Write an enzyme that holds these catalytic residues in place. Structure first.
Site, short mmCIF file in Angstrom:
data_model
loop_
_atom_site.label_atom_id
_atom_site.label_comp_id
_atom_site.label_asym_id
_atom_site.label_seq_id
_atom_site.Cartn_x
_atom_site.Cartn_y
_atom_site.Cartn_z
N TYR A 136 34.46 50.87 35.91
CA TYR A 136 36.13 50.66 36.28
C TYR A 136 36.57 51.47 37.40
O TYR A 136 36.57 52.11 38.05
CB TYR A 136 36.93 52.11 34.97
CG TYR A 136 37.38 51.27 33.68
CD1 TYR A 136 39.00 49.78 33.46
CD2 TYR A 136 36.62 51.42 32.21
CE1 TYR A 136 39.00 50.11 32.59
CE2 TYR A 136 37.44 51.04 31.16
CZ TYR A 136 38.05 50.38 31.43
OH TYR A 136 39.68 49.62 30.19
N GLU A 189 38.93 50.71 38.73
CA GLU A 189 40.13 49.47 38.91
C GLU A 189 41.20 50.17 39.96
O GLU A 189 41.02 50.92 40.63
CB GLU A 189 41.43 50.55 38.03
CG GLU A 189 40.92 50.03 36.13
CD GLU A 189 41.61 50.39 34.98
OE1 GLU A 189 42.55 49.97 34.59
OE2 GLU A 189 42.16 51.85 35.42
N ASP A 196 45.04 23.80 43.35
CA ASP A 196 44.09 24.21 41.84
C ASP A 196 43.28 23.62 42.40
O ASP A 196 42.59 22.68 41.80
CB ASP A 196 44.83 24.26 41.10
CG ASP A 196 44.62 25.68 39.48
OD1 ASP A 196 42.85 25.75 39.97
OD2 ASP A 196 44.90 25.65 38.43
N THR A 218 38.73 28.08 39.95
CA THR A 218 37.64 28.60 39.26
C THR A 218 35.64 28.92 39.73
O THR A 218 35.73 27.90 41.33
CB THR A 218 36.87 27.47 37.78
OG1 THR A 218 36.81 26.45 38.54
CG2 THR A 218 38.47 28.19 37.32
N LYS A 265 32.34 25.23 37.62
CA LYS A 265 32.33 24.30 37.76
C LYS A 265 31.83 23.59 38.91
O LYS A 265 30.09 23.60 38.96
CB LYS A 265 34.13 23.65 38.05
CG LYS A 265 34.85 23.95 36.73
CD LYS A 265 35.92 23.61 37.04
CE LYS A 265 36.87 23.55 35.68
NZ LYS A 265 38.18 23.24 35.96
N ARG A 292 31.46 32.65 35.39
CA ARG A 292 33.11 32.31 34.42
C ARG A 292 34.00 33.25 36.00
O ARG A 292 33.61 34.33 34.49
CB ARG A 292 33.31 31.95 33.35
CG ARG A 292 33.03 30.64 32.73
CD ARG A 292 33.34 30.07 31.88
NE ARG A 292 33.33 28.94 31.47
CZ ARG A 292 32.52 28.54 30.61
NH1 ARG A 292 31.66 28.48 30.17
NH2 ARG A 292 33.47 26.76 30.97
N1 Y6U Z 1 47.62 57.29 30.78
C1 Y6U Z 1 46.73 56.07 31.39
N2 Y6U Z 1 45.39 57.17 32.67
C2 Y6U Z 1 45.09 56.25 33.11
C3 Y6U Z 1 44.19 55.62 34.34
C4 Y6U Z 1 44.21 54.86 34.81
N3 Y6U Z 1 45.39 53.87 34.23
C5 Y6U Z 1 44.70 52.53 34.62
C6 Y6U Z 1 45.70 52.30 35.85
C7 Y6U Z 1 46.92 53.29 35.68
C8 Y6U Z 1 47.38 52.54 37.19
C9 Y6U Z 1 49.18 53.46 37.43
C10 Y6U Z 1 49.86 52.98 38.96
C11 Y6U Z 1 49.18 52.07 39.66
C12 Y6U Z 1 50.00 51.82 40.82
O1 Y6U Z 1 49.49 50.57 41.56
N4 Y6U Z 1 51.28 52.51 41.24
C13 Y6U Z 1 51.73 52.68 42.59
C14 Y6U Z 1 51.97 50.73 43.33
C15 Y6U Z 1 50.68 50.73 44.51
C16 Y6U Z 1 52.04 51.61 45.99
O2 Y6U Z 1 51.75 49.87 46.30
O3 Y6U Z 1 51.12 52.64 46.14
C17 Y6U Z 1 53.44 52.26 42.19
O4 Y6U Z 1 53.82 53.19 40.97
O5 Y6U Z 1 54.80 52.40 43.04
C18 Y6U Z 1 47.95 51.42 39.66
C19 Y6U Z 1 47.03 51.71 38.43
C20 Y6U Z 1 45.49 54.50 33.31
C21 Y6U Z 1 46.68 54.09 32.04
O6 Y6U Z 1 47.33 52.99 32.61
N5 Y6U Z 1 47.13 55.05 32.09
C1 PLP Z 2 41.15 50.44 27.93
C2 PLP Z 2 42.78 50.01 28.02
C3 PLP Z 2 43.00 48.52 27.99
C4 PLP Z 2 42.48 47.45 28.15
O1 PLP Z 2 42.44 47.68 29.94
P1 PLP Z 2 41.48 46.98 30.71
O2 PLP Z 2 41.17 46.97 31.77
O3 PLP Z 2 42.67 45.80 31.43
O4 PLP Z 2 40.27 46.60 29.87
C5 PLP Z 2 44.66 48.56 27.71
N1 PLP Z 2 45.20 49.76 27.46
C6 PLP Z 2 44.52 51.22 26.96
C7 PLP Z 2 45.03 52.07 25.91
C8 PLP Z 2 43.69 51.06 27.37
O5 PLP Z 2 42.83 51.92 27.44
C1 PLP Z 3 38.86 23.97 35.08
C2 PLP Z 3 40.95 23.96 35.75
C3 PLP Z 3 41.30 25.39 35.44
C4 PLP Z 3 40.50 26.19 33.84
O1 PLP Z 3 40.50 27.85 34.38
P1 PLP Z 3 40.10 29.18 33.30
O2 PLP Z 3 40.84 29.97 33.15
O3 PLP Z 3 38.68 28.83 33.95
O4 PLP Z 3 39.89 27.72 31.59
C5 PLP Z 3 42.44 25.34 34.91
N1 PLP Z 3 43.49 24.44 35.97
C6 PLP Z 3 42.86 24.15 37.12
C7 PLP Z 3 43.39 22.69 37.79
C8 PLP Z 3 40.77 23.38 36.77
O5 PLP Z 3 40.78 22.20 37.40
#
Ligand code: Y6U
Ligand code: PLP
Ligand code: PLP
Ligand code: Y6U
Ligand code: Y6U
Ligand code: Y6U
Ligand code: PLP
Ligand code: PLP
Lengths: 462, 462, 462, 462
Positions: free
Chosen positions: C54, C56, C209, C235, C238, C244
């Site tokens: 992760y 993030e 695009d 993308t 292609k 992907r």
């Molecule tokens: N409970 C909970 N735990 C976790 C653990 C991970 N995550 C996922 C990521 C959480 C997260 C929160 C805030 C920002 C952020 O970008 N904050 C700044 C802007 C940046 C700037 O420009 O300084 C702002 O708030 O201003 C990014 C990521 C979670 C979640 O979602 N929930």
């Molecule tokens: C993991 C999770 C998601 C999805 O996070 P992705 O980084 O998009 O996979 C969304 N909501 C909750 C509460 C989660 O725990």
């Molecule tokens: C191929 C193509 C996509 C496809 O997007 P996906 O998220 O990969 O499905 C979108 N926009 C244009 C203009 C493309 O040529």
């Protein structure tokens, strides 16, 4: 304190301003195409006890009580509204509570459109009003461009007419849900049949904002938009010559028959529009204005109003042809309604300069962007109106004398364009120069003498 | 044709309606807190010649010309508006162009907010107006709740007062950008200091809607919201006893400052408020109404108005105590402004049955949702207002007998609520019966004979 | 359970489906212009341990810890992205976290546009993608038409090219804030210089695009859109022949110099776009895909990829001219990129019929709406692609043999159009008829023999 | 060129990064509650040939052809998804196409809601995800809070649990249309019965985001949200130990019925959910990921997964009690699922200092906002997860010594928080010092030597 003492004794500061404004209307040549002089009968109802009634709701659907008389008044105004425009009550209902023409148009959009829904009106420099969704290249001007995404259609500058071809082409791409068929500065007849063909294709409503031409429509001197429009909005003044208010005419009955089912599909405009006016946008209606609207509406169904509106058309074309002979060009050649659009550019002056010139000689006109110039450039045109003087029993040769007074004003401003460079140099030179001040004063006095001789609707005093 | 003919000469059908409404206003005891009888001085200015001047724009920044006289009338109205509420022209501005109170609230929203921005107002069953973002569980009602996202704050059901603590927490969650301290049915004062408390914490605007209490604020009786509210909107009628229009007061000058910011952060409400009224939402101003509200604004600075105003509160306590001393509970227990909030659930009747039996006897009130109404269908409460009848020189003893007819009215309605189960069968019994009709036909003659003695502000015939 | 046992022993049901799909790709003639065969080196990184991280945030701005290695991986992908397209790092940054091409385009709109802001992309039946704001005449199809108001620009059906004239005309009226310069079904080069002139006039961003042509741009065999575009999306599969995913190229540096001030005005794309991808729209990036994107990006900067993309253009025009000699017409005459648009209408068959015919003989093509037909009518055209077979070392005379197999399929479908009436009668007749089934089986076997002889990127097994 | 060359042969620079990340995963104690080590069976399917099939559409309703094999792979994934959570294919459906968890939540919003519709999720400092409409006092963060209006519900600061009563009241005021029962940092179960309680009263949808607890629900350990939630969204990794993708489970069949309604009111979520994923928001599916999540979905029905799952909760209590028996308070006092919410304010350190000292010793955690954090700058809490290490056969005693390194880590961070005042000077001391570096360099060798013994699911080299 009883509250029954006259304004002259209660507020001398305001009663003087009342008489000073009444003198300005009597001594000036009111040439603004949107302005008219309301009758005394309507003004007696506008400033009456009906102000004191909160009639929130509708006749028979009032939130309060004691609306016994204002129901009869609001219903009579609706009957007189439909009677003035030869509308069948089974095909047309009308709302008489819009505070003015601008709140009327927003009521139609709020009624039938979601926020950010799409509309198409004539562009503001092209002749359309703000309420038709005018937005600039920097800022959303009208709130119609904020609460709804508007794209304007433009005129064809070669002819000065509405570009009905480009409208149909862009309507297919923009896909609007409502198209406005109405103008503020346009001297020609709107092809409502062509507007309906476009609206029928892109599945859009056809709104006719006949504010500038409602009186001519009520007198049946020009084609009526009700033959093609779904919703029809209008101000209650202007060519209608009534108190400042608005109306909303909507189609009631059956929209069409089901294609594959064979079933009558109704119209759903009445309850959507009546709900948008109240309780969505407005509160308690101005029953004093509603009554005044009804008084002017009763006057519209009379042979008097048919003769008045007919003289308006005659005066407008008499003013048009007079302007043509003196060397002035007109947008779209001439006029088919109540106003003419003068193009002062081939004469060496702009509208912003000439309107200030005519303003100083008690000739109130307004500058108009001419087809071609990119809006922001100083408008090189004026918009002249007939219904204002025609209400004062003006004749064709009287408007021909009006054009003579404009020819002198333009020539006075032309001599200042050479003596000045900027527009504010032009404005200040008209007031500070010794020779230019007296010639403006001489033309003003000659204008005010000729103007005061004609009658004037309303009270003698105010 | 002339246009100077009388209303009784040209349109007799409308003239009879004008007298039938004036006679209805005189013969009845208007008790709606929102109603008031305007003076003749303003009615002369309302139905004046200013209806015939398209003065679109603002003084000095007009779109046309010939606005020479209408400019000083608007500026005198602006000066009288700040003078009536004792506002420094350096700290406060005003827009005198809103067509009514509802357009005044929509304008400031468009001025300071974007579409779907968060607002917070008092719920309509709790005493808030439609224009405060009234939303239902079934539908969006006010356009303030359609074009903007609204969450209502409620009353404390045990105290009958605004739940300032529940508001303080829901604001931190809803994160609003503007909160309205308005009131349509709330007989006590609003802690504007505690609302600035909440608005400063959630970084939101504090707009006061003193439409119902605006003359009580102008007369410097109840505390003024201008100490705290950044913006203040108001209707020109109601407590000020003027024509039907609107006002938008806004703080202008310097917000805060900082040695880190270099200089001072200025109040930027003026241009936003003015642009929102025109050219965004409205169009041609109703300067005939602007003149009439300038008339009543000058009356608001007189020692007579404060004398009239104080009698409204004195009649409020007179109506409240007399109702309390007859077996009627009141929401929050009494009054502290101009209106009284009865609770008819103890007496045995409801608001819908009572406002009809009282309207059928020339005593017009209105339904009201009381805290604890076990049914939304039929509310158990009315709202009676002092400003309406106090304008006819009503002392405390005069109001103390208006509740005698009221108590007689509710008792008549109580003796049929058992005779008739459902309301639609209730309403049908007050006219199909030979006894109940005589019971009410005799009550209102003693009611109309009692009302006709006091003089009516305004004209005599209309 | 250790989790280290192969898929063959763990899930035989899925491992069989894996080999059944691998056989379909090896035995079929993959003619879909958007499809390519990813290399084994990238697929080894796509299905690796990087799934378990992760990450993030962004390199150096991670919310978590332990992102030591994935930072080097994400940074290397950015350097290889800018290196593959000859971009200067001081003028161009790139985001490598878009999950696919569709989430990439929405990230650009979310970054630079408010909700309901306006965009303009090529219409979907005209060649544009859904993400360019495609909406039908009944329903908002793409979410790009919901969160933003899109108006499409169309082709000129006389030439088959983009109507750059009508685009400039409608852009002035629609006033979009972002114009998409990219296609999905378009065989010609986009005039990016003309797109920038339109965008510079209406003050709009120019988004390119280049998903279908990114590989050709990276090999510098066609004009690069980076010379004119502000933001460039693509993308990663292609023509790029990778896993992907998606990329977002944005301009960094100085936008322009102040006109009246003389000051360098910066670009504000990086932090707006990087914030839109995370944390606005997405969560943890797919580092396994990001790595696989980097492997394919490293391959794009090699003389191998320059030769491959060059053969794609040669194969496409060899397929085009071959189709022309057999009697087939092509949209816009021929091709300048990797795909051709066949017009089967002058040959008596529609694309919906021929694609099903070619599908049954392991020739995967797609129907295409031809310029002129009103979309809903059964498309009378096909879209054929070169990069898929060219990745398998296909030559010009190999694609000429491809056209021979299409000519047989079209003729088989032509004989069924006469034997059938509807499209489902056509589809069922191809499977149930005795004679038509064996001729489809004979052509399929002859197609699969010729197709299996060529190599295939990826694993031998799956 | 061939495309079948190994990754180590073609791209050695990327191959070394693949091993450096795999060695980092093995040498460390991954304790992030969202992390997990995927099996080799799914990694073989993730990096498979299915990356080369544009299967836009849905099985049987595909946009192209040649989707013969990918259709049954998606349907097997759909069948395995309902079978793993014991769902009747007559009462429940599933979409297996969302690219990840964040796109899965945006899809269902677009499916059932309009722009700016009201949603309610747990606040991010309280434990909710970004995708639950996280809005700040300063800015809109998640696109779920931009394209939709969001108001967060909070925790009880005294209990550490969801304030179901505060939610019950704020919902009646906010009037939401969908409420999310999701969790990113909440170690106890969610009363889905009490959330259906609130959603049925305010007539809103109840969507469960079991992304963090989805395998615990699949293994039928903790109660299942499918009893109450109308819709259920999920990430394919985290607790299920699969590839990175998303799932959207939706109730289908019959909602309610009535003899007054005639028949039955059906669940209309299926077509809305599917259309929102494609063609609204996404495009070409990542069926190579869909295959990998189908692999791990079949593993979720095995008796091994329930055995693995139960150990996660057993390790959760093991980590919680061991932390409690060492001077650490926990939010809500312990755990009841897979994660633990420490509170480091008692121990003397904060989350930012602790997650860095622990990351510098191959013990990766994350910051967490604990109820009562007197500062938003530096939160006083971490979040440690069992599913990550339990996938390496970690018993309760194995986790009971991972907290020994943790307690040693926080004590090292405690002995510098006094030595270094500000965090940026804190972070600089862990590497510029000769003693503190040796303090940490020796701790992680005993930490990496302890971690390297347990086997890693997936491949060996990458
Ligand atoms: N409970 C909970 N735990 C976790 C653990 C991970 N995550 C996922 C990521 C959480 C997260 C929160 C805030 C920002 C952020 O970008 N904050 C700044 C802007 C940046 C700037 O420009 O300084 C702002 O708030 O201003 C990014 C990521 C979670 C979640 O979602 N929930
Ligand atoms: C993991 C999770 C998601 C999805 O996070 P992705 O980084 O998009 O996979 C969304 N909501 C909750 C509460 C989660 O725990
Ligand atoms: C191929 C193509 C996509 C496809 O997007 P996906 O998220 O990969 O499905 C979108 N926009 C244009 C203009 C493309 O040529
Ligand atoms: N054909 C037509 N003729 C007339 C004649 C009168 N009207 C009524 C509308 C008059 C009007 C139009 C535009 C603005 C405006 O935009 N003012 C901004 C400019 C800022 C910016 O554009 O950036 C400012 O004052 O600064 C204000 C008032 C119409 C009409 O509607 N149509
Ligand atoms: N405290 C307070 N007191 C008063 C006294 C008067 N008013 C002003 C008017 C109040 C009002 C409220 C609701 C509706 C309405 O139209 N309701 C129906 C829709 C109609 C249908 O189609 O049945 C619905 O809610 O469904 C109309 C007017 C107020 C105020 O605003 N506040
Ligand atoms: N030139 C171009 N070629 C291709 C080839 C593939 N694509 C990707 C997009 C494929 C696609 C397009 C439209 C719909 C759709 O609208 N389906 C509704 C119809 C309902 C209604 O329209 O009313 C339904 O399935 O019912 C679904 C999928 C493109 C592209 O984007 N452009
Ligand atoms: C009177 C009033 C208004 C304005 O009502 P209108 O009918 O539009 O004049 C608005 N809000 C409140 C609280 C009011 O009392
Ligand atoms: C005159 C006119 C208006 C004016 O509306 P008001 O509310 O009276 O200012 C609006 N629209 C059109 C088309 C007009 O002709």
């Amino acid at each position: 304190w009883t509250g029954q003492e006259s304004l002259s004794d209660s507020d001398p500061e305001m009663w003087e301003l009342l008489q000073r404004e009444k003198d300005r209307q009597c001594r000036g040549l009111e040439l603004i195409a949107s302005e008219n002089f309301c009758s005394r009968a309507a003004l007696e109802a506008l400033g009456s006890c009906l102000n004191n009634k909160y009639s929130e709701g509708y006749p028979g659907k009032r939130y309060y009580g004691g609306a016994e008389v204002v129901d009869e008044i609001e219903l009579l105004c609706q009957r007189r509204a439909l009677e003035a425009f030869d509308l069948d009550p089974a095909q047309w209902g009308v709302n008489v509570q819009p505070y003015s023409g601008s709140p009327a148009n927003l009521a139609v959009y709020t009624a039938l459109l979601q926020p950010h829904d799409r509309i198409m009106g004539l562009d503001l420099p092209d002749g359309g009003h703000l309420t038709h969704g005018y937005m600039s290249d920097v800022k959303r001007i009208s709130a119609t461009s904020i609460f709804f995404e508007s794209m304007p259609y433009k005129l064809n500058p070669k002819t000065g007419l509405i570009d009905y071809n480009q409208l149909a082409l862009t309507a297919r791409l923009f896909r609007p849900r409502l198209i406005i068929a109405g103008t503020s500065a346009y001297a020609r007849l709107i092809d409502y049949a062509r507007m309906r063909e476009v609206c029928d294709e892109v599945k859009a409503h056809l709104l006719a904002d006949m504010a500038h031409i409602s009186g001519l429509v009520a007198a049946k001197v020009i084609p009526s938009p009700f033959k093609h429009a779904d919703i029809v909005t209008t101000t209650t003044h202007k060519t209608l010559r009534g108190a400042r208010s608005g109306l909303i005419f909507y189609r009631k009955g059956v929209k069409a028959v089901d294609p594959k089912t064979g079933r009558e599909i109704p119209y759903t405009f009445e309850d959507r529009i009546n709900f948008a006016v109240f309780p969505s946008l407005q509160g308690g209606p101005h029953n004093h204005a509603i009554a005044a609207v009804a008084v002017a509406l009763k006057q519209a169904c009379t042979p008097m109003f048919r003769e008045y509106s007919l003289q308006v058309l005659k005066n407008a074309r008499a003013m048009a042809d007079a302007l043509l002979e003196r060397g002035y060009s007109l947008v779209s050649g001439g006029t088919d309604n109540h106003l003419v659009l003068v193009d002062l550019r081939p004469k060496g002056l702009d509208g912003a300069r000439a309107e200030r010139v005519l303003e100083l000689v008690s000739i109130t006109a307004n500058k108009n962007t001419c087809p071609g110039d990119r809006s922001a450039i100083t408008p090189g045109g004026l918009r002249l109106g007939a219904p204002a003087l025609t209400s004062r029993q003006f004749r064709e040769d009287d408007f021909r004398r009006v054009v003579d007074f404009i020819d002198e004003g333009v020539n006075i401003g032309l001599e200042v364009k050479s003596k000045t460079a900027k527009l504010q140099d032009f404005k200040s030179f008209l007031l500070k120069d010794s020779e230019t001040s007296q010639r403006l004063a001489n033309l003003r006095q000659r204008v005010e003498q000729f103007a005061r001789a004609f009658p004037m609707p309303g009270f003698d005093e105010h």
